Amino acid sequence: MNPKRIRALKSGKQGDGPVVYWMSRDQRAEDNWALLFSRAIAKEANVPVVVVFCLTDEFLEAGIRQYEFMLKGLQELEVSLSRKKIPSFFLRGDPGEKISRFVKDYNAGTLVTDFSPLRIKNQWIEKVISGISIPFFEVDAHNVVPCWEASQKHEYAAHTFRPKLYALLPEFLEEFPELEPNSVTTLSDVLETGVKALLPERALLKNKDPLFEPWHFEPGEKAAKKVMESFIADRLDSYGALRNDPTKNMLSNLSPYLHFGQISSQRVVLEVEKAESNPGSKKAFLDEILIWKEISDNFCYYNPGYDGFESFPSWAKESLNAHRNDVRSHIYTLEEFEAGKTHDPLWNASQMELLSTGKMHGYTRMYWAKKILEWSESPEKALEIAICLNDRYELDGRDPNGYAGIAWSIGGVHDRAWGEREVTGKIRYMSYEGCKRKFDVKLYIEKY
Numbered sequence: 001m002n003p004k005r006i007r008a009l010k011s012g013k014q015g016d017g018p019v020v021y022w023m024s025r026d027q028r029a030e031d032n033w034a035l036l037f038s039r040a041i042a043k044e045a046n047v048p049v050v051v052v053f054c055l056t057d058e059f060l061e062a063g064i065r066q067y068e069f070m071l072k073g074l075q076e077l078e079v080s081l082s083r084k085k086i087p088s089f090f091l092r093g094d095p096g097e098k099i100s101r102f103v104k105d106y107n108a109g110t111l112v113t114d115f116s117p118l119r120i121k122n123q124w125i126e127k128v129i130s131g132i133s134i135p136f137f138e139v140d141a142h143n144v145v146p147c148w149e150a151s152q153k154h155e156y157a158a159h160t161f162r163p164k165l166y167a168l169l170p171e172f173l174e175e176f177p178e179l180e181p182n183s184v185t186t187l188s189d190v191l192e193t194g195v196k197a198l199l200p201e202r203a204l205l206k207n208k209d210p211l212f213e214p215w216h217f218e219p220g221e222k223a224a225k226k227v228m229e230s231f232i233a234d235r236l237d238s239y240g241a242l243r244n245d246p247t248k249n250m251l252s253n254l255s256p257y258l259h260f261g262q263i264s265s266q267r268v269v270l271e272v273e274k275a276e277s278n279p280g281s282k283k284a285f286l287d288e289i290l291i292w293k294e295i296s297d298n299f300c301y302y303n304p305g306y307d308g309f310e311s312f313p314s315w316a317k318e319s320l321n322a323h324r325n326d327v328r329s330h331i332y333t334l335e336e337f338e339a340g341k342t343h344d345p346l347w348n349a350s351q352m353e354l355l356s357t358g359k360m361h362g363y364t365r366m367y368w369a370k371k372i373l374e375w376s377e378s379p380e381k382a383l384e385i386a387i388c389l390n391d392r393y394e395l396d397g398r399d400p401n402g403y404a405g406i407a408w409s410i411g412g413v414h415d416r417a418w419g420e421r422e423v424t425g426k427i428r429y430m431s432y433e434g435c436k437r438k439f440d441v442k443l444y445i446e447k448y
């Protein structure tokens with residue numbers, strides 16, 4: 001149990017009651033670091049361990065596709081904690097007052113939470129810190145190597161981040177010890193009154209039919225593992241060659257589970273490394289889930305304006321500035337972008353998959369975002385529209401990987417300089433003709 005995963009947020013007088021785990025990002029009972037040290041603090045100090053979840057008031061900022069996915073997984077989570085004699089308490093409201101009152105009411109001893117580099121998580125931390133006197137600990141339960149330990153600076157490329165991370169797997173890539181149960185110590189209602197609030201804003205087709213199709217991804221910790229096992233057994237070997245083909249379902253399809261923390265990324269890395277497949281296919285998968293996933297946490301942790309034009313590289317910021325008011329071929333508003341009413345059928349098909357399935361293919365996720373920069377009056381508007389569409393309709397949205405992906409597509413973050421072109425500038429360019437030579441585009445639009 002490496003202590004480098006644990007960092008101190010506020011020092012105080014150790015309390016008396018149960019050690020409270022404030023779960024935010026890693027919604028799982030197994031392979032969850034944050035629970036293990038919470039039990040370790042509960043084992044080496046002889047106190048009960050409890051888990052507290054906050055149903056915040058920003059859920060209406062998204063759709064019912066994310067709300068119902070998260071609550072269904074929470075339903076499975078709390079029955080797994082009951083089997084370990086670990087009670088789970090769910091609060092409705094802003095964590096700044098909910099967490100502080102819970103600690104005082106239950107006389108909690110030490111408060112522990114998992115790590116998330118998002119601005120919203122930080123906002124909740126400051127309010128909680130000012131309202132509590134018990135020790136406050138935080139742990140990186142989402143990354144194989146701690147975000148502050150992989151690097152203490154913003155990495156400008158995957159070229160420089162890869163050797164740094166790859167030098168610390170032997171230190172941190174280790175197996176998970178079993179969850180020790182406590183010695184001795186409704187979700188359906190909140191879901192019902194919840195969806196009744198997001199119902200009038202549900203995405204719909206013309207006549208009356210909701211566009212979302214919820215049978216593609218079953219939520220829950222148990223369902224996440226089955227997706228992982230199916231990916232290793234059936235899609236690992238062909239991943240390297242079929243990574244960039246949207247017409248084939250050769251991806252791991254684990255992003256909604258990883259974003260909600262229903263499955264640990266370290267468990268995925270452990271199973272894939274022990275699995276035997278094509279070496280190029282394996283190295284391609286490990287790069288995506290280790291290098292590119294954890295560099296997004298670094299990007300958001302060391303760039304406060306990660307969702308702004310200020311976080312772009314200097315070469316890119318100058319390049320788009322020289323091409324700021326170049327006469328755009330098309331200019332589409334947010335609603336035209338949202339409903340999929342552009343002149344590009346390939347982009348329209350990408351939005352259709354986003355609207356219907358809630359998870360758009362990774363290769364088209366790069367064409368989709370970069371094309372917004374083409375048909376936006378300014379790069380700031382383009383960054384804006386991409387974030388709004390991503391965080392609203394993506395099951396894996398509102399994630400550090402999302403903002404790093406948008407920054408990569410629009411601002412060239414973690415990329416390099418390419419051929420200068422109008423409007424887009426020096427940013428990497430993806431053309432519709434270029435996609436025709438890479439995969440069968442006609443099949444993509446036909447399906448969506």
Ligand SMILES: Cc1cc2nc3c(=O)[nH]c(=O)nc-3n(C[C@H](O)[C@H](O)[C@H](O)COP(=O)(O)OP(=O)(O)OC[C@H]3O[C@@H](n4cnc5c(N)ncnc54)[C@H](O)[C@@H]3O)c2cc1C
Pocket residue numbers: 251252253254255258259288289290292293296360361362365366369390394396397398399401402403404405406408409
């Ligand atoms: C504009 C944009 C928005 C995105 N939105 C999200 C998002 O909200 N949440 C999210 O987790 N990923 C996001 N992605 C990153 C990437 O598209 C997804 O990781 C990947 O498509 C998820 O599908 P997968 O896990 O089934 O495929 P896989 O090829 O299997 O990827 C496996 C894991 O690696 C991660 N990953 C894969 N590609 C990237 C990448 N370019 N950057 C960072 N991580 C990656 C994902 O965590 C993923 O689960 C976004 C990428 C871009 C360019």
Ligand code: NA
Pocket residue numbers: 384388
């Ligand atoms: Na906005």
